[PDB]
Scaffold this active site. Structure first.
Site, PDB file in Angstrom:
ATOM      1  N   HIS A  41       0.806  -1.219   0.000  1.00 30.78           N
ATOM      2  CA  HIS A  41       0.000   0.000   0.000  1.00 30.78           C
ATOM      3  C   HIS A  41       0.839   1.268   0.000  1.00 30.78           C
ATOM      4  CE1 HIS A  41       0.071  -0.446   4.604  1.00 30.78           C
ATOM      5  NE2 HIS A  41       0.467   0.804   4.440  1.00 30.78           N
ATOM      6  N   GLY A 143       3.231   5.650  10.238  1.00 35.09           N
ATOM      7  CA  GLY A 143       4.590   5.436   9.794  1.00 35.09           C
ATOM      8  C   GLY A 143       5.194   4.120  10.222  1.00 35.09           C
ATOM      9  N   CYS A 145       4.102   1.071   9.452  1.00 32.02           N
ATOM     10  CA  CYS A 145       3.929  -0.031   8.514  1.00 32.02           C
ATOM     11  C   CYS A 145       5.269  -0.481   7.950  1.00 32.02           C
ATOM     12  CB  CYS A 145       2.988   0.371   7.374  1.00 32.02           C
ATOM     13  SG  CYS A 145       1.304   0.435   7.980  1.00 32.02           S
TER      14      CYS A 145
END
Ligand SMILES: *[C@H](O)[C@H](C[C@@H]1CCNC1=O)NC(=O)[C@H](CC1CC1)NC(=O)OCc1ccccc1
Ligand SMILES: *[C@H](O)[C@H](C[C@@H]1CCNC1=O)NC(=O)[C@H](CC1CC1)NC(=O)OCc1ccccc1
Lengths: 303, 303
Positions: A41, A143, A145
């Protein structure tokens, strides 16, 4: 002695964390040999994430759309591909700090260490159990991920988790390193929720054994019960059923303490029916289910 | 979101751990530049440890009595000296992985990460608070001495603890890296015990703020109290007195939640007098006091 929730030393994984930037999105990636793994993503914009077609979005990207940074040193992307929900970026440099590693998928009830990272920089380490409903109870901010979860066995890092999202109840969801989600979740901004959860019975029993090894004995009793009778109590209190294999894996702890598993099950039955009456076990006033038998043996063998 | 007890990433300290052997005793040392620091009781035999005179015992040692191993590579000792309860071994090689570091002594109520090590090899990482009675509630087995505690601030490692011993209640004691014990303890096998402990009030309040930030609000109420009136309740329940400086350091959390410190103190008063009535706060059924305001802000600012 002492029993503490304990993470694996994070150094081998710290040497693999990089920052991946695409457009205005920056998250973390895992750099192993000449490949960087991160959540797919990262290629999405704010409006892309409502209902993305990732095959279309990746076809419209090129290598130069991806900024990879190992600290100050920028890494040159020379290829890109998708594997399920993870993006793989091929880079022109093999990570000199790549550990011996495996990609493994873990089972509900098993634990792993999470190295929380922001902007490619590790910030903290903690233990998580995979819940029966395939979520974890983490601590993740924007942030985070691309942060990964792992276990270590004789300098071999087994990666089992990459972080992707937070559910409405505040728990967290992600994938294995092949990009397959744990649980019935998808990487888009929609209305997903965790299913009903249950308590991990074998882990509670393992923690009761840790307690005895560390001198907490007040909950013990002279009674023994049967597997079938205990499993009737487990259903009433939303505990997983105890299998004979679970009894077998608790063998070493049963031997070390001289308390049969079905003996300890009688204690758990009483704790479930009566509560603690103001007392604590290993510093907790609740029955803890996020320690595996392995986790317990690691800290309690020497005691 | 989410709030988890979290250690600092351990990689910078992992690169400093070595194994120190003297006679039949093997423990851990900390290798910084060309000096290895370890507990001085490594030079003792079983009978030496009942009532040792360390000046005599060290005078009778020479450099060749000390075996230092950084993994497989043996390090050559070229000098030795004592600083309080820590032994300093000068070696013929500066550690190429030495981080920027400080030696700092911490205050009761403050937290740090412990890297548990055996035979020079890190095994796990976890957070500890220095108790008001100068012990820590660790997880240490035989061979763990020389394991260190630390905080990290912008790639600077502040070392604050080296492990030396376990007290009869199962808690742990050690020194700063200058070799001065935390608390009224000594490095010999005698009959030492921890003094009475108290609960760290500012930390409980910080954790209540973490709870609110993470959506646990059931314990809140409309009441406010005064500092003097709250400190009367604190004495009854063996809590530290609240100072104006503590109110000031809770300022940011008070601002983020819109709940005044004296407003939250009324909630703590009610929790102390009434208990939880079967409910939980951040997954605990007890009031937790091992999170500092800094620890909370680190995880809750982004929320
Ligand atoms: C990736 O860094 C981020 C991690 C979230 C941010 C806050 N805590 C986390 O764990 N993931 C997301 O933003 C995902 C992206 C969609 C999966 C494609 N969305 C998400 O988590 O939305 C829920 C949420 C909750 C609270 C704050 C922000 C987002
Ligand atoms: C050093 O490795 C060791 C650490 C102890 C061992 C078990 N858990 C620990 O934290 N320290 C000692 O053995 C010290 C040495 C004396 C301080 C000079 N002694 C000690 O801790 O005795 C208590 C004890 C308790 C349980 C098991 C062994 C020893």
């Amino acid at each position: 002695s002492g029993f503490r929730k304990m993470a694996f030393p994070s150094g081998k994984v710290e040497g693999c964390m990089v920052q991946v930037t695409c457009g205005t999105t920056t998250l973390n990636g895992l750099w192993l040999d000449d490949v960087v793994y991160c959540p797919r993503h990262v290629i999405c914009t704010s409006e892309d994430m409502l209902n993305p077609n990732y095959e279309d979005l990746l076809i419209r990207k090129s290598n130069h759309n991806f900024l990879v940074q190992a600290g100050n040193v920028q890494l040159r992307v020379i290829g890109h591909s998708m594997q399920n929900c993870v993006l793989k970026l091929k880079v022109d440099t093999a990570n000199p700090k790549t550990p011996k590693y495996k990609f493994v998928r873990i089972q509900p009830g098993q634990t792993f260490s999470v190295l929380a990272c922001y902007n490619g920089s590790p910030s903290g380490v903690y233990q998580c159990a995979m819940r029966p409903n395939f979520t974890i109870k983490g601590s993740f901010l924007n942030g985070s991920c691309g942060s990964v979860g792992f276990n270590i066995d004789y300098d071999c890092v087994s990666f089992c988790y990459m972080h992707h999202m937070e559910l409405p109840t505040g728990v967290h969801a992600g994938t294995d390193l092949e990009g397959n989600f744990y649980g019935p979740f998808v990487d888009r901004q929609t209305a997903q929720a965790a299913g009903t959860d249950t308590t991990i019975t074998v882990n509670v029993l393992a923690w009761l054994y840790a307690a005895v090894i560390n001198g907490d004995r007040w909950f013990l009793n002279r009674f023994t019960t049967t597997l079938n009778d205990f499993n009737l109590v487990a259903m009433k209190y939303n505990y997983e059923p105890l299998t004979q294999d679970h009894v077998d894996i608790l063998g070493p702890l049963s031997a070390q303490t001289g308390i049969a598993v079905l003996d300890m099950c009688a204690s758990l039955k009483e704790l479930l029916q009566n509560g603690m009456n103001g007392r604590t076990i290993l510093g907790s006033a609740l029955l803890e289910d996020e320690f595996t038998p392995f986790d317990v043996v690691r800290q309690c063998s020497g005691v």
